[PDB]
């Protein structure tokens, strides 16, 4: 019923995104050391049904980042535009030489090749410990949002064409996760205990919510419909994951439905929702990939030990055919779903 396949990409992977139905973008590396381990962007064609590794995972192109660059920490892609969070060498950073840590690439869909376009230093930081925590770009590729680990927490909303900052949002607490609505006109973000919704056009508040259970730690957020977000939280005391749907309208929010979908794990490291808005995928702390059917908020399948440790990102192809996950254990896990699985 499910076809699965695994591949060792050759370096610890920290980001993954599907460029189309069939093509996976992966980013990561061994970091800045003179260690014989590359820092790379890798583009692969995947087909988990085939018999050999070369057929299941075909590498279309690779971009070698600097051997003395940090490993990439975050990526996203939309319509051939690729945005990558990646510190330069710590020495260059520390000695005030500049940190072009937000980089723009182009994937040529016909050439399959990767091109470095331009990069920019947004944080103006001289602390090598600061990294780009979140990188997201809207479906149409017209707006993006990035988030530093640095203090105080700031969300920058930028133009992906030339990497200019549209506006700077000083968030109140630490930004946990982040998502754009499908039209790209709204970005929603979460801290550990609040939801904030902002227009990407004006920078104005649209809606806000802070009355979550005090035992909840908000973890991830994805849009599932035009005016509806899905928030994943973990139990502070106890073990479990709550998925909640919150509707956003006219300055107010309302909880459509809330439900704990499992008690098997303590927390999750990644979440994605398919474009159809029907399926959610979770990557757990204990290294599982879980499939959640959004109509019922029910967990319908768990792939135990899909990586050996640290699952960094999970991504669903636009046709809802493949579920891809990558980890710091150097592995890529591919799941093929039966057609209309969630239905």
Nearest distance, CB of residue 123 and K ion, angstroms: 15
Given a contact cutoff of 8 angstroms between Cβ atoms, the answer to whether 146 and 164 are in contact is no
Binding mask 283-312 for K ion (x = CB under 5 A): ------------------------------
- CA–CA distance, 59 with 206 (Å, rounded to integer): 43
Single out the residue of 67, 115, 121, 130 in contact with K ion (rule: CB under 5 A): 67
148 binds K ion (CB under 5 A): no
For K ion, which is the closer residue by CB, 81 or 231?
Answer: 231
Does the bond joining 286 to the residue before it have cis omega, within 30 degrees of 0? no
Q: For residues 90 and 258, which CB has a smaller minimum distance to K ion in the complex?
A: 90
Tell me if 196 contacts K ion by CB under 5 A: no
Ordered strands of the 132-137 beta sheet: 132-137, 144-148, 154-159, 164-170
Min dist CB 201 to K ion, Å, is: 20
Q: Which of positions 150-179 make contact with K ion (CB under 5 A)?
A: 177, 179
Q: How far apart are CA 136 and CA 213, in angstroms?
A: 28
Q: Is 115 in the site for K ion (CB under 5 A)?
A: no
Cβ neighbours, 10 Å, residue 238: 10
Of 23, 42, 56, 71, the residue at the interface with K ion (CB under 5 A) is: 71
Helix or strand (DSSP H, E) at 55 = helix 53-56
The beta-strand segments (E) located in 141-251 are 144-148, 154-159, 164-170, 177-180, 186-190, 195-199, 205-209, 216-225, 228-235, 241-249
18-47: contacts with K ion (CB under 5 A): 30, 35
Nearer Cβ to K ion (71/217)? 71
Do residues 324 and 315 lie in contact, with contact meaning Cβ atoms separated by under 8 Å?
A: yes
Closer of 217 and 222 to K ion (Cβ): 222
Q: How far is the CB of 211 from K ion (least distance, A)?
A: 22
Among 63-71, 203-211, 255-263, 333-341, which window interacts with K ion (CB under 5 A)? Answer: 63-71
Options 42, 70, 147, 218; binder of K ion; rule CB under 5 A: 70
- For residue 294, the 8-state DSSP code is T
Residue number, 200 or 222, with CB nearest to K ion: 222
Residue 124 CA: distances (Å) to CA of 10, 33, 119, 150: 32, 23, 13, 11
Residue 289 CA from chain centroid, whole number: 15
Taking the complex as a whole, how short is the minimal distance between the CB of residue 235 and K ion, in angstroms? 20
Interacting residues with K ion (CB under 5 A) = 30, 35, 67, 70-71, 73, 177, 179, 222
């Amino acid at each position: 019923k499910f076809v699965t396949a695994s591949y060792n990409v050759g370096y610890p992977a920290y980001g993954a995104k599907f460029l189309n139905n069939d093509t996976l973008l992966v980013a990561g590396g061994g970091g800045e050391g003179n260690n014989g381990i590359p820092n790379k962007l890798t583009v692969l064609r995947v087909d988990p049904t085939k018999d050999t590794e070369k057929e299941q995972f075909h590498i279309l192109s690779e971009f070698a980042l600097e051997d003395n660059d940090d490993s990439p920490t975050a990526i996203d892609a939309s319509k051939g535009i690729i945005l990558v969070g990646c510190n330069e060498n710590s020495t260059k950073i520390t000695q005030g030489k500049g940190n072009k840590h937000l980089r723009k690439f182009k994937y040529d869909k016909v050439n399959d090749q990767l091109e470095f376009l331009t990069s920019v230093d947004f944080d103006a930081s001289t602390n090598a410990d600061d990294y780009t925590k979140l990188v997201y770009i809207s479906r149409e590729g017209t707006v993006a949002a990035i988030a530093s680990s640095k203090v105080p927490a700031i969300m920058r909303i930028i133009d992906p064409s030339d990497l200019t900052e549209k506006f700077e949002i000083e968030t109140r607490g630490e930004v946990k996760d982040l998502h754009f609505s499908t039209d790209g006109k709204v970005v929603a973000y979460i801290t550990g205990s609040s939801l904030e919704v902002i227009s990407t056009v004006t920078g104005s508040c649209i809606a806000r919510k802070t009355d979550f259970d005090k035992n909840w730690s908000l973890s991830k957020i994805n849009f599932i419909a035009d005016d509806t977000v899905l928030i994943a939280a973990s139990l502070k005391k106890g073990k479990g994951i709550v998925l909640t749907k919150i509707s956003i309208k006219s300055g107010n929010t309302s909880v459509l439905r809330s439900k704990q979908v499992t008690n098997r794990f303590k927390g999750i490291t990644s979440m994605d929702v398919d474009m159809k808005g029907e399926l959610a995928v979770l990557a757990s702390n204990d290294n599982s990939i879980a499939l959640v059917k959004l109509k019922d908020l029910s967990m319908s399948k768990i792939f135990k030990q899909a990586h050996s440790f640290a699952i960094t990102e999970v991504t669903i192809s636009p046709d809802s055919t493949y579920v891809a996950s990558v980890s710091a254990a150097n592995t890529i896990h591919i799941i093929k779903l039966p057609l209309n699985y969630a239905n």
